[PDB]
Each structure stands twice: as structure tokens, then as C-alpha cells.
Tab-separated table of N, CA and C and ligand atoms in Angstrom:
chain	number	residue	atom	x	y	z
A	1	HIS	N	87.020	115.721	160.899
A	1	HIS	CA	87.370	114.333	161.148
A	1	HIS	C	86.429	113.741	162.185
A	2	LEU	N	85.235	113.368	161.738
A	2	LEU	CA	84.235	112.793	162.630
A	2	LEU	C	84.910	111.810	163.574
A	3	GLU	N	84.803	112.078	164.870
A	3	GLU	CA	85.447	111.276	165.895
A	3	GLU	C	84.528	110.146	166.344
A	4	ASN	N	85.148	109.055	166.808
A	4	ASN	CA	84.471	107.950	167.481
A	4	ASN	C	83.493	107.203	166.580
A	5	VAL	N	83.311	107.663	165.351
A	5	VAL	CA	82.291	107.110	164.471
A	5	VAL	C	82.915	106.038	163.590
A	6	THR	N	82.142	104.990	163.308
A	6	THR	CA	82.581	103.887	162.459
A	6	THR	C	81.461	103.519	161.485
A	7	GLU	N	81.124	104.452	160.601
A	7	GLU	CA	80.089	104.195	159.610
A	7	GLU	C	80.593	103.229	158.544
A	8	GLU	N	79.683	102.393	158.059
A	8	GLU	CA	80.011	101.391	157.059
A	8	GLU	C	79.735	101.944	155.666
A	9	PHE	N	80.715	101.809	154.778
A	9	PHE	CA	80.594	102.241	153.393
A	9	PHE	C	80.327	101.048	152.483
A	10	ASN	N	79.860	101.352	151.275
A	10	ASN	CA	79.731	100.357	150.218
A	10	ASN	C	79.895	101.075	148.890
A	11	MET	N	80.910	100.689	148.120
A	11	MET	CA	81.241	101.375	146.879
A	11	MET	C	80.605	100.734	145.654
A	12	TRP	N	80.104	99.506	145.771
A	12	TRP	CA	79.415	98.873	144.655
A	12	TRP	C	77.910	99.069	144.719
A	13	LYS	N	77.351	99.157	145.921
A	13	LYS	CA	75.950	99.500	146.109
A	13	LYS	C	75.743	100.995	146.330
A	14	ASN	N	76.773	101.808	146.103
A	14	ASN	CA	76.652	103.253	146.242
A	14	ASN	C	76.021	103.849	144.993
A	15	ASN	N	75.116	104.803	145.198
A	15	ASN	CA	74.346	105.374	144.102
A	15	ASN	C	74.964	106.644	143.533
A	16	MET	N	76.004	107.190	144.167
A	16	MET	CA	76.679	108.349	143.592
A	16	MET	C	77.362	108.004	142.276
A	17	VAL	N	77.755	106.741	142.097
A	17	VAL	CA	78.364	106.335	140.836
A	17	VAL	C	77.302	106.174	139.753
A	18	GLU	N	76.087	105.758	140.122
A	18	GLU	CA	75.019	105.641	139.137
A	18	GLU	C	74.460	107.010	138.767
A	19	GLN	N	74.346	107.918	139.742
A	19	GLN	CA	74.023	109.303	139.415
A	19	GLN	C	75.066	109.891	138.480
A	20	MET	N	76.336	109.545	138.696
A	20	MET	CA	77.398	109.994	137.805
A	20	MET	C	77.162	109.494	136.385
A	21	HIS	N	76.788	108.220	136.251
A	21	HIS	CA	76.678	107.601	134.934
A	21	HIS	C	75.596	108.270	134.094
A	22	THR	N	74.375	108.355	134.630
A	22	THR	CA	73.273	108.939	133.876
A	22	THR	C	73.432	110.440	133.676
A	23	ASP	N	74.272	111.100	134.477
A	23	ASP	CA	74.521	112.520	134.253
A	23	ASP	C	75.403	112.737	133.031
A	24	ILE	N	76.467	111.943	132.890
A	24	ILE	CA	77.372	112.111	131.756
A	24	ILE	C	76.649	111.831	130.446
A	25	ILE	N	75.845	110.764	130.408
A	25	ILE	CA	75.109	110.425	129.192
A	25	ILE	C	74.191	111.574	128.791
A	26	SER	N	73.402	112.077	129.742
A	26	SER	CA	72.518	113.200	129.444
A	26	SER	C	73.305	114.476	129.180
A	27	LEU	N	74.514	114.581	129.730
A	27	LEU	CA	75.352	115.748	129.477
A	27	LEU	C	75.995	115.679	128.097
A	28	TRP	N	76.380	114.478	127.666
A	28	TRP	CA	76.953	114.302	126.336
A	28	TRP	C	75.914	114.572	125.254
A	29	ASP	N	74.723	113.983	125.396
A	29	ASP	CA	73.684	114.143	124.383
A	29	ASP	C	73.206	115.586	124.285
A	30	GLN	N	73.275	116.339	125.383
A	30	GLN	CA	72.885	117.741	125.329
A	30	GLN	C	73.905	118.588	124.581
A	31	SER	N	75.151	118.129	124.490
A	31	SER	CA	76.206	118.854	123.801
A	31	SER	C	76.363	118.430	122.344
A	32	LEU	N	75.446	117.613	121.824
A	32	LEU	CA	75.472	117.221	120.420
A	32	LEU	C	74.143	117.544	119.755
A	33	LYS	N	73.084	117.625	120.560
A	33	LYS	CA	71.743	117.901	120.050
A	33	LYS	C	71.671	119.143	119.168
A	34	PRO	N	72.236	120.299	119.544
A	34	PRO	CA	72.188	121.444	118.628
A	34	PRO	C	73.432	121.567	117.769
A	35	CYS	N	73.531	120.780	116.695
A	35	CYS	CA	74.682	120.869	115.803
A	35	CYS	C	74.286	120.331	114.435
A	36	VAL	N	75.281	120.149	113.570
A	36	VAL	CA	75.051	119.728	112.192
A	36	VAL	C	74.830	118.221	112.149
A	37	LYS	N	73.673	117.802	111.636
A	37	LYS	CA	73.407	116.390	111.396
A	37	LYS	C	73.930	116.003	110.022
A	38	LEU	N	74.577	114.842	109.950
A	38	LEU	CA	75.231	114.394	108.726
A	38	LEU	C	74.459	113.262	108.058
A	39	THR	N	73.138	113.395	108.001
A	39	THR	CA	72.338	112.448	107.232
A	39	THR	C	72.704	112.391	105.749
A	40	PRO	N	73.070	113.487	105.064
A	40	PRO	CA	73.430	113.354	103.643
A	40	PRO	C	74.702	112.548	103.395
A	41	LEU	N	75.461	112.193	104.430
A	41	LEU	CA	76.730	111.493	104.258
A	41	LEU	C	76.566	110.019	103.905
A	42	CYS	N	75.343	109.542	103.692
A	42	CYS	CA	75.094	108.135	103.368
A	42	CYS	C	74.874	108.031	101.862
A	43	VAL	N	75.972	107.888	101.120
A	43	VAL	CA	75.936	107.645	99.683
A	43	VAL	C	76.950	106.552	99.370
A	44	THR	N	76.887	106.041	98.144
A	44	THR	CA	77.866	105.056	97.704
A	44	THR	C	79.233	105.716	97.578
A	45	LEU	N	80.225	105.148	98.253
A	45	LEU	CA	81.569	105.709	98.307
A	45	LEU	C	82.515	104.844	97.488
A	46	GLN	N	83.229	105.465	96.555
A	46	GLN	CA	84.230	104.782	95.741
A	46	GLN	C	85.603	105.247	96.211
A	47	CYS	N	86.365	104.332	96.805
A	47	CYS	CA	87.581	104.678	97.525
A	47	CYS	C	88.761	103.878	96.994
A	48	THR	N	89.955	104.402	97.251
A	48	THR	CA	91.193	103.806	96.774
A	48	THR	C	92.252	103.875	97.863
A	49	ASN	N	93.277	103.033	97.723
A	49	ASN	CA	94.431	103.052	98.617
A	49	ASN	C	95.216	104.351	98.463
A	50	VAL	N	96.339	104.466	99.169
A	50	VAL	CA	97.164	105.667	99.113
A	50	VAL	C	98.637	105.263	99.135
A	51	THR	N	99.319	105.443	98.003
A	51	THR	CA	100.783	105.394	97.915
A	51	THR	C	101.358	104.105	98.507
A	52	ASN	N	100.813	102.968	98.069
A	52	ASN	CA	101.598	101.740	98.111
A	52	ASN	C	102.838	101.889	97.242
A	53	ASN	N	102.712	102.660	96.156
A	53	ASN	CA	103.767	102.899	95.170
A	53	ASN	C	104.148	101.618	94.433
B	1	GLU	N	115.563	85.676	91.907
B	1	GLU	CA	114.521	85.066	91.090
B	1	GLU	C	113.673	86.130	90.406
B	2	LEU	N	114.325	87.009	89.648
B	2	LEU	CA	113.638	88.018	88.858
B	2	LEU	C	114.215	88.027	87.447
B	3	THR	N	113.591	88.816	86.577
B	3	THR	CA	113.952	88.888	85.169
B	3	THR	C	114.483	90.274	84.833
B	4	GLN	N	115.548	90.315	84.032
B	4	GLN	CA	116.124	91.568	83.581
B	4	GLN	C	116.658	91.347	82.174
B	5	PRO	N	116.521	92.321	81.280
B	5	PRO	CA	117.045	92.159	79.924
B	5	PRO	C	118.550	92.344	79.922
B	6	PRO	N	119.301	91.415	79.350
B	6	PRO	CA	120.763	91.508	79.441
B	6	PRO	C	121.369	92.503	78.465
B	7	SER	N	120.732	92.695	77.313
B	7	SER	CA	121.335	93.459	76.227
B	7	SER	C	120.257	94.277	75.534
B	8	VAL	N	120.275	95.586	75.754
B	8	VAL	CA	119.494	96.533	74.970
B	8	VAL	C	120.468	97.573	74.437
B	9	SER	N	120.244	98.029	73.204
B	9	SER	CA	121.055	99.087	72.615
B	9	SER	C	120.142	100.207	72.139
B	10	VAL	N	120.604	101.457	72.246
B	10	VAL	CA	119.781	102.613	71.906
B	10	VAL	C	120.669	103.737	71.395
B	11	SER	N	120.047	104.723	70.766
B	11	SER	CA	120.819	105.792	70.149
B	11	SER	C	121.336	106.760	71.213
B	12	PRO	N	122.552	107.285	71.055
B	12	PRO	CA	123.063	108.258	72.028
B	12	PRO	C	122.309	109.579	71.958
B	13	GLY	N	122.264	110.276	73.093
B	13	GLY	CA	121.484	111.495	73.180
B	13	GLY	C	119.986	111.297	73.152
B	14	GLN	N	119.515	110.053	73.205
B	14	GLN	CA	118.096	109.727	73.209
B	14	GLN	C	117.746	108.986	74.495
B	15	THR	N	116.448	108.877	74.755
B	15	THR	CA	115.972	108.225	75.968
B	15	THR	C	116.039	106.706	75.829
B	16	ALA	N	116.154	106.027	76.971
B	16	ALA	CA	116.312	104.579	77.016
B	16	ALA	C	115.357	103.979	78.040
B	17	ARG	N	115.280	102.648	78.033
B	17	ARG	CA	114.297	101.912	78.819
B	17	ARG	C	114.949	100.675	79.414
B	18	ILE	N	114.891	100.549	80.737
B	18	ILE	CA	115.381	99.374	81.447
B	18	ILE	C	114.225	98.772	82.231
B	19	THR	N	114.139	97.445	82.232
B	19	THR	CA	113.051	96.735	82.883
B	19	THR	C	113.590	95.722	83.885
B	20	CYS	N	112.784	95.444	84.906
B	20	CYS	CA	113.051	94.356	85.842
B	20	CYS	C	111.703	93.832	86.313
B	21	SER	N	111.395	92.586	85.965
B	21	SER	CA	110.079	92.004	86.188
B	21	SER	C	110.132	90.963	87.295
B	22	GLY	N	109.102	90.956	88.133
B	22	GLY	CA	109.029	90.009	89.232
B	22	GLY	C	107.744	90.209	90.006
B	23	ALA	N	107.504	89.285	90.932
B	23	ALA	CA	106.297	89.295	91.752
B	23	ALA	C	106.428	90.193	92.982
B	24	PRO	N	107.529	90.116	93.765
B	24	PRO	CA	107.595	90.940	94.980
B	24	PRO	C	107.897	92.408	94.713
B	25	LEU	N	107.389	92.957	93.607
B	25	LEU	CA	107.548	94.376	93.312
B	25	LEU	C	106.582	95.252	94.101
B	26	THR	N	105.993	94.713	95.168
B	26	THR	CA	105.139	95.471	96.067
B	26	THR	C	105.762	95.725	97.430
B	27	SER	N	106.833	95.010	97.782
B	27	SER	CA	107.378	95.037	99.134
B	27	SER	C	108.450	96.102	99.327
B	28	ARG	N	109.331	96.299	98.343
B	28	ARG	CA	110.445	97.219	98.547
B	28	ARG	C	111.041	97.770	97.256
B	29	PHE	N	110.295	98.641	96.580
B	29	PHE	CA	110.828	99.508	95.528
B	29	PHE	C	111.578	98.683	94.484
B	30	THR	N	112.733	99.164	94.003
B	30	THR	CA	113.439	98.575	92.866
B	30	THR	C	114.959	98.601	93.038
B	31	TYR	N	115.576	99.777	92.852
B	31	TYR	CA	117.029	99.974	92.803
B	31	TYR	C	117.610	99.397	91.514
B	32	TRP	N	118.829	99.809	91.156
B	32	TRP	CA	119.501	99.269	89.978
B	32	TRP	C	121.015	99.214	90.157
B	33	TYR	N	121.649	100.392	90.226
B	33	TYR	CA	123.099	100.594	90.254
B	33	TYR	C	123.739	100.291	88.901
B	34	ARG	N	124.952	100.807	88.672
B	34	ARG	CA	125.678	100.605	87.423
B	34	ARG	C	127.086	100.104	87.712
B	35	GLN	N	127.570	99.199	86.863
B	35	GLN	CA	128.846	98.518	87.069
B	35	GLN	C	129.792	98.881	85.929
B	36	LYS	N	130.697	99.821	86.186
B	36	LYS	CA	131.757	100.108	85.239
B	36	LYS	C	132.775	98.970	85.249
B	37	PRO	N	133.543	98.811	84.168
B	37	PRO	CA	134.584	97.774	84.162
B	37	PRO	C	135.643	98.003	85.230
B	38	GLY	N	135.712	97.095	86.203
B	38	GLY	CA	136.710	97.180	87.251
B	38	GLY	C	136.456	98.225	88.312
B	39	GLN	N	135.203	98.622	88.522
B	39	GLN	CA	134.856	99.623	89.519
B	39	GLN	C	133.652	99.144	90.321
B	40	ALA	N	133.430	99.795	91.475
B	40	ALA	CA	132.329	99.451	92.361
B	40	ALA	C	131.046	100.159	91.928
B	41	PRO	N	129.889	99.548	92.175
B	41	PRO	CA	128.623	100.166	91.770
B	41	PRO	C	128.332	101.443	92.545
B	42	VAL	N	127.437	102.251	91.978
B	42	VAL	CA	127.039	103.528	92.554
B	42	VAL	C	125.519	103.627	92.516
B	43	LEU	N	124.955	104.376	93.467
B	43	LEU	CA	123.511	104.554	93.526
B	43	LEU	C	122.997	105.268	92.279
B	44	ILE	N	122.254	104.543	91.443
B	44	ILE	CA	121.567	105.187	90.331
B	44	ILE	C	120.365	105.963	90.844
B	45	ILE	N	119.685	105.417	91.846
B	45	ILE	CA	118.414	105.942	92.307
B	45	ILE	C	118.278	105.568	93.772
B	46	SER	N	117.516	106.369	94.507
B	46	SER	CA	117.430	106.221	95.948
B	46	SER	C	116.011	106.538	96.388
B	47	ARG	N	115.785	106.518	97.700
B	47	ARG	CA	114.461	106.808	98.237
B	47	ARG	C	114.613	107.504	99.582
B	48	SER	N	114.139	108.746	99.665
B	48	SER	CA	114.238	109.544	100.879
B	48	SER	C	112.925	109.644	101.645
B	49	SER	N	111.791	109.521	100.945
B	49	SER	CA	110.468	109.245	101.516
B	49	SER	C	109.391	109.303	100.439
B	50	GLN	N	108.724	108.175	100.213
B	50	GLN	CA	107.518	108.111	99.379
B	50	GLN	C	107.894	108.498	97.950
B	51	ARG	N	107.200	109.442	97.307
B	51	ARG	CA	107.372	109.649	95.866
B	51	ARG	C	108.712	110.282	95.505
B	52	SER	N	109.244	111.149	96.363
B	52	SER	CA	110.444	111.926	96.057
B	52	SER	C	111.653	110.994	96.041
B	53	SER	N	111.853	110.343	94.893
B	53	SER	CA	112.913	109.355	94.734
B	53	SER	C	113.653	109.551	93.414
B	54	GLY	N	112.982	109.271	92.295
B	54	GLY	CA	113.554	109.503	90.982
B	54	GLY	C	113.855	110.966	90.736
B	55	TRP	N	112.786	111.754	90.585
B	55	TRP	CA	112.821	113.209	90.468
B	55	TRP	C	113.886	113.727	89.509
B	56	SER	N	114.850	114.496	90.019
B	56	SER	CA	115.576	115.457	89.189
B	56	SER	C	117.087	115.247	89.110
B	57	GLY	N	117.630	114.164	89.661
B	57	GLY	CA	118.992	113.806	89.314
B	57	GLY	C	119.203	113.636	87.825
B	58	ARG	N	118.123	113.338	87.091
B	58	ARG	CA	117.963	112.905	85.702
B	58	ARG	C	117.147	111.627	85.822
B	59	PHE	N	117.367	110.635	84.956
B	59	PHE	CA	116.705	109.341	85.105
B	59	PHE	C	115.202	109.521	85.191
B	60	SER	N	114.668	108.998	86.287
B	60	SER	CA	113.255	108.950	86.587
B	60	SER	C	112.841	107.507	86.344
B	61	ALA	N	111.840	107.039	87.074
B	61	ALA	CA	111.402	105.662	86.916
B	61	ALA	C	109.902	105.529	87.028
B	62	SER	N	109.363	104.493	86.403
B	62	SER	CA	107.933	104.258	86.439
B	62	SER	C	107.654	102.823	86.823
B	63	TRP	N	106.567	102.619	87.553
B	63	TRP	CA	106.210	101.275	87.995
B	63	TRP	C	104.796	100.972	87.507
B	64	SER	N	104.701	100.245	86.394
B	64	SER	CA	103.417	99.937	85.778
B	64	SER	C	102.678	98.861	86.564
B	65	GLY	N	103.035	97.600	86.338
B	65	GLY	CA	102.393	96.500	87.028
B	65	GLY	C	103.376	95.458	87.515
B	66	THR	N	103.546	94.384	86.740
B	66	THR	CA	104.489	93.337	87.124
B	66	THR	C	105.931	93.809	86.970
B	67	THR	N	106.226	94.534	85.895
B	67	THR	CA	107.565	95.033	85.624
B	67	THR	C	107.624	96.536	85.858
B	68	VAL	N	108.809	97.015	86.217
B	68	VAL	CA	109.041	98.430	86.458
B	68	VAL	C	109.927	98.979	85.350
B	69	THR	N	109.930	100.304	85.225
B	69	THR	CA	110.635	100.987	84.150
B	69	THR	C	111.598	102.017	84.723
B	70	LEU	N	112.774	102.120	84.108
B	70	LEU	CA	113.778	103.121	84.460
B	70	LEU	C	113.896	104.078	83.277
B	71	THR	N	112.909	104.957	83.146
B	71	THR	CA	112.924	105.969	82.094
B	71	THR	C	114.055	106.944	82.390
B	72	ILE	N	115.193	106.771	81.718
B	72	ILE	CA	116.379	107.593	81.953
B	72	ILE	C	116.236	108.919	81.207
B	73	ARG	N	117.133	109.871	81.476
B	73	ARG	CA	117.034	111.217	80.925
B	73	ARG	C	117.269	111.207	79.412
B	74	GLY	N	117.258	112.402	78.819
B	74	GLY	CA	117.376	112.501	77.373
B	74	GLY	C	118.768	112.165	76.871
B	75	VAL	N	119.786	112.820	77.427
B	75	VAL	CA	121.155	112.581	76.986
B	75	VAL	C	121.622	111.225	77.494
B	76	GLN	N	122.221	110.438	76.602
B	76	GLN	CA	122.759	109.129	76.946
B	76	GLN	C	124.194	108.987	76.455
B	77	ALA	N	124.939	110.089	76.426
B	77	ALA	CA	126.281	110.099	75.854
B	77	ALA	C	127.280	109.551	76.867
B	78	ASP	N	127.870	108.395	76.547
B	78	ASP	CA	129.032	107.815	77.224
B	78	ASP	C	128.721	107.183	78.582
B	79	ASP	N	127.593	107.531	79.204
B	79	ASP	CA	127.221	106.913	80.474
B	79	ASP	C	126.801	105.462	80.269
B	80	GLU	N	127.743	104.603	79.885
B	80	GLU	CA	127.435	103.232	79.502
B	80	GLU	C	128.200	102.245	80.366
B	81	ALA	N	127.469	101.296	80.936
B	81	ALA	CA	128.040	100.237	81.752
B	81	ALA	C	126.984	99.143	81.874
B	82	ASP	N	127.178	98.231	82.824
B	82	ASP	CA	126.218	97.175	83.118
B	82	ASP	C	125.345	97.587	84.300
B	83	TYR	N	124.040	97.336	84.179
B	83	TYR	CA	123.047	97.703	85.183
B	83	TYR	C	122.351	96.452	85.698
B	84	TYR	N	122.166	96.378	87.015
B	84	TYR	CA	121.528	95.256	87.670
B	84	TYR	C	120.207	95.709	88.313
B	85	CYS	N	119.739	94.949	89.307
B	85	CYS	CA	118.521	95.227	90.067
B	85	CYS	C	118.648	94.578	91.438
B	86	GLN	N	118.156	95.264	92.478
B	86	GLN	CA	118.350	94.828	93.859
B	86	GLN	C	117.012	94.372	94.411
B	87	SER	N	116.340	95.170	95.243
B	87	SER	CA	115.021	94.842	95.832
B	87	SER	C	115.043	93.664	96.806
B	88	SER	N	114.031	93.605	97.672
B	88	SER	CA	113.870	92.563	98.685
B	88	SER	C	112.587	91.783	98.416
B	89	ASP	N	112.285	90.852	99.315
B	89	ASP	CA	111.162	89.941	99.162
B	89	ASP	C	109.952	90.432	99.956
B	90	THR	N	108.817	89.758	99.739
B	90	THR	CA	107.578	90.135	100.412
B	90	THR	C	107.683	89.970	101.920
B	91	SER	N	108.399	88.945	102.382
B	91	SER	CA	108.630	88.738	103.803
B	91	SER	C	109.896	89.436	104.279
B	92	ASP	N	110.399	90.408	103.515
B	92	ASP	CA	111.588	91.184	103.860
B	92	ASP	C	112.841	90.318	103.984
B	93	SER	N	112.661	89.020	104.206
B	93	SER	CA	113.788	88.103	104.310
B	93	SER	C	114.501	88.018	102.968
B	94	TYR	N	115.834	88.025	103.026
B	94	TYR	CA	116.751	87.914	101.891
B	94	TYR	C	116.483	88.884	100.739
B	95	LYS	N	117.415	88.918	99.793
B	95	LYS	CA	117.361	89.769	98.616
B	95	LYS	C	117.750	88.944	97.402
B	96	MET	N	117.014	89.115	96.314
B	96	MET	CA	117.313	88.413	95.080
B	96	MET	C	117.813	89.407	94.041
B	97	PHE	N	118.903	89.038	93.376
B	97	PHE	CA	119.433	89.746	92.220
B	97	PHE	C	119.191	88.888	90.988
B	98	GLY	N	118.647	89.493	89.936
B	98	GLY	CA	118.323	88.744	88.738
B	98	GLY	C	119.036	89.215	87.488
B	99	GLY	N	120.332	89.495	87.607
B	99	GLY	CA	121.078	89.976	86.468
B	99	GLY	C	120.576	91.345	86.037
B	100	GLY	N	121.044	91.754	84.868
B	100	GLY	CA	120.642	93.039	84.345
B	100	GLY	C	121.256	93.315	82.996
B	101	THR	N	121.198	94.585	82.599
B	101	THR	CA	121.467	95.006	81.233
B	101	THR	C	122.857	95.605	81.073
B	102	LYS	N	123.375	95.499	79.852
B	102	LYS	CA	124.569	96.212	79.411
B	102	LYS	C	124.205	96.943	78.126
B	103	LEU	N	124.094	98.265	78.208
B	103	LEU	CA	123.695	99.094	77.080
B	103	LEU	C	124.931	99.657	76.385
B	104	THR	N	124.812	99.871	75.075
B	104	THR	CA	125.906	100.383	74.262
B	104	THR	C	125.398	101.511	73.375
C	1	LIG	C1	94.925	98.163	98.835
C	1	LIG	O1	95.776	97.445	99.735
C	1	LIG	C2	95.253	96.177	100.113
C	1	LIG	C3	96.261	95.568	101.074
C	1	LIG	O2	97.535	95.479	100.420
C	1	LIG	C4	95.094	95.307	98.875
C	1	LIG	O3	94.534	94.051	99.268
C	1	LIG	C5	95.419	93.047	98.736
C	1	LIG	O4	95.192	92.910	97.330
C	1	LIG	C6	96.108	92.011	96.714
C	1	LIG	C7	95.854	92.093	95.211
C	1	LIG	O5	94.443	92.167	94.975
C	1	LIG	C8	95.930	90.610	97.300
C	1	LIG	O6	96.973	89.760	96.811
C	1	LIG	C9	96.464	88.778	95.889
C	1	LIG	O7	96.559	87.453	96.401
C	1	LIG	C10	95.950	86.525	95.504
C	1	LIG	C11	95.804	85.182	96.204
C	1	LIG	O8	95.167	85.471	97.452
C	1	LIG	C12	94.914	84.273	98.201
C	1	LIG	O9	96.058	83.832	98.928
C	1	LIG	C13	96.606	84.895	99.708
C	1	LIG	C14	97.917	84.436	100.335
C	1	LIG	O10	98.726	83.785	99.349
C	1	LIG	C15	95.599	85.272	100.787
C	1	LIG	O11	96.115	86.360	101.562
C	1	LIG	C16	94.279	85.683	100.146
C	1	LIG	O12	93.292	85.913	101.158
C	1	LIG	C17	93.808	84.586	99.199
C	1	LIG	O13	93.488	83.408	99.949
C	1	LIG	C18	96.786	86.461	94.230
C	1	LIG	O14	96.255	85.480	93.333
C	1	LIG	C19	96.798	87.848	93.593
C	1	LIG	O15	97.626	87.881	92.415
C	1	LIG	C20	97.108	87.855	91.012
C	1	LIG	O16	96.000	86.951	90.664
C	1	LIG	C21	94.702	87.211	91.215
C	1	LIG	C22	93.749	86.075	90.856
C	1	LIG	O17	93.703	85.916	89.434
C	1	LIG	C23	94.215	88.551	90.684
C	1	LIG	O18	92.929	88.851	91.236
C	1	LIG	C24	95.214	89.638	91.071
C	1	LIG	O19	94.807	90.889	90.504
C	1	LIG	C25	96.603	89.260	90.555
C	1	LIG	O20	96.596	89.308	89.123
C	1	LIG	C26	97.298	88.860	94.618
C	1	LIG	O21	98.666	88.590	94.938
C	1	LIG	C27	96.084	90.649	98.817
C	1	LIG	O22	95.766	89.368	99.378
C	1	LIG	C28	95.175	91.706	99.429
C	1	LIG	N1	95.431	91.816	100.857
C	1	LIG	C29	96.654	91.760	101.388
C	1	LIG	C30	96.862	90.691	102.421
C	1	LIG	O23	97.552	92.526	101.072
C	1	LIG	C31	94.213	95.992	97.838
C	1	LIG	O24	94.140	95.194	96.643
C	1	LIG	C32	94.798	97.369	97.542
C	1	LIG	N2	94.028	98.056	96.520
C	1	LIG	C33	94.621	98.750	95.547
C	1	LIG	C34	93.702	99.434	94.576
C	1	LIG	O25	95.835	98.833	95.456
């Protein structure tokens, strides 16, 4: 409990939140890069409703 | 404000056909019930969830397009009375009855 000190904070000009932001983005993309790409899923789809009855 | 045939006759022990035609046949199923002389109606058909409705009591029903069908079972011996139709409207508000059939 730092005594006698009165340091000024700023939560909107703080860069720990921006470091947080770019870390998650790079962390998300690293967890999808080695997996199955679904490029063949782009075909004409013929679809219907379900049990309006 | 629906249509129902008042008088159809068919051979006993054979299959029969009942129709009820209308526009709001998309909002709430069909129903029919049967009216014996001087007695209260009884559930001909019901709905417990989705397709499992007609099934195996006998009867069975089909819904083509504008009009629906009550394909009844094979035996038709003595089970004779007057049949109506219930159903609700597209806005769920109120219910219309449009008469029905008396088979012999
Ligand atoms: C899967 O489920 C969706 C949602 O239920 C269905 O989409 C509905 O489809 C029906 C039927 O195609 C549409 O209802 C039609 O409305 C026509 C008039 O529409 C105008 O006015 C209404 C309001 O009164 C507006 O909502 C609409 O935007 C329009 O301005 C009627 O004319 C239709 O009836 C008959 O005539 C027409 C014209 O000749 C024919 O094309 C029809 O086949 C029919 O013979 C009909 O009532 C409805 O608007 C759609 N959405 C809604 C809000 O439910 C899909 O159709 C369905 N697909 C399958 C395969 O079931």
C-alpha cells in the first residue's frame, strides 16, 4: 500500500487496454490458422422450411 | 368462414374422406369432433407435438394445400354421426366453425 503517494491514473489513455486488444486478435487468429478451411462450402444451396405442417 | 361438405355417404367397412377448406389452414391445425344425437362431442384427433397427432388411434389425416383430409381407418361400421371442424385464425384471434358432414 504505497504510502503518501498520489499518482494520477487515466483509464482511457491507458495502453494496457490497447495491448489487451491486439493480443486477443492475434491470439484468436493463431487458434484458427491451423485447421480445416471450408472453401468448398460455396455452392448453390437448395433449402426448404421445416414442419410448418 | 370455412367450407365443409354436409353430406357424404360411403360403404361400411371401407375408407372414407372428410374435407374442410379454408385460408387460415396454416395457423392452427384442423380438429373435427363427432356429434352423436343428443350427446356431447369427443376428440376425434389431437396434437401432442408436431407430427405425432393422427397416428394410430385409427383415422389419420392429410393436409394437401387449401383443403385438408381426414383419411379415416378401414372399418367404418356403425361409427356414424355428424362431424364438424374447429381451428383458429391467422392472428390467433377468435375461432370459426364452418359446419360439417353427416355420413351414413
Ligand atoms: C417458409 O416459411 C416462410 C414464412 O412462413 C414462407 O414465407 C411466406 O410465404 C407465404 C406463401 O408464399 C407468403 O404468404 C403469401 O402472401 C401473399 C400476399 O403477400 C403480400 O401481402 C402480405 C400480407 O397480406 C405481405 O406479407 C407480403 O409481403 C406481400 O405484400 C398471398 O398472395 C399468398 O397467397 C397465394 O397467392 C400468391 C400470389 O398468387 C401465391 O404466390 C401463393 O402461392 C398463394 O397461392 C400467400 O398468402 C408469406 O407472406 C411469406 N412470409 C410470411 C410473412 O409468412 C415460405 O413461403 C415458406 N416456404 C415453404 C416452402 O413453405
